[PDB]
Amino acid sequence: PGNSAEAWYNLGNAYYKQGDYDEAIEYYQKALELYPNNAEAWYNLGNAYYKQGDYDEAIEYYQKALELYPNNAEAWYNLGNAYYKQGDYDEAIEYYQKALELYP
Amino acid sequence: PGNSAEAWYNLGNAYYKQGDYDEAIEYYQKALELYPNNAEAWYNLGNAYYKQGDYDEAIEYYQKALELYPNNAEAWYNLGNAYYKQGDYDEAIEYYQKALELYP
Secondary structure, three states: OOOOHHHHHHHHHHHHHHOOHHHHHHHHHHHHHHOOOOHHHHHHHHHHHHHHOOHHHHHHHHHHHHHHOOOOHHHHHHHHHHHHHOOOHHHHHHHHHHHHHOOO | OOOOHHHHHHHHHHHHHHOOHHHHHHHHHHHHHHOOOOHHHHHHHHHHHHHHOOHHHHHHHHHHHHHHOOOOHHHHHHHHHHHHHOOOHHHHHHHHHHHHHOOO
């Protein structure tokens, strides 16, 4: 359409910035259909789900992001945050500590 | 003797690096006697106590460090660690989150 994975990813980001999380998700998913290994699309998808209060979904996507890009301190942080928002303090701490050991 | 707060602080650091925590503490304390507001001496004193397993002492010193130098992300982190090592997960998380919001 629609042949650059980056373009759909950029559009996801612009909707996300505007607070239109539903739209952002559909674009990120299109980026990932073209390019399933796009760690940055998995990550921002996680963020979009997090912002909606769907912490289970965010966790699953963050996990995929981190499998492909394990030096993303910010994603470790947000993974920690997602567990924190579920009341899983043990896991929040584990991932906060991982985020903090990647700095700088 | 012994008139540069920095010199005593540097010596504290060299002992600390060598694993001689007892000695490191005595030097940091001398730095602080000259210069009670030395945030970096309070901080590394905390570290020295932490390394000995005296987490209460480390916390108290980290607190002083952070009152004087609140943008020290690393000190927030180690404060979190000190509470973590005491099993106070609520406080560990609070300070981990503060450390992580100071990055970068």
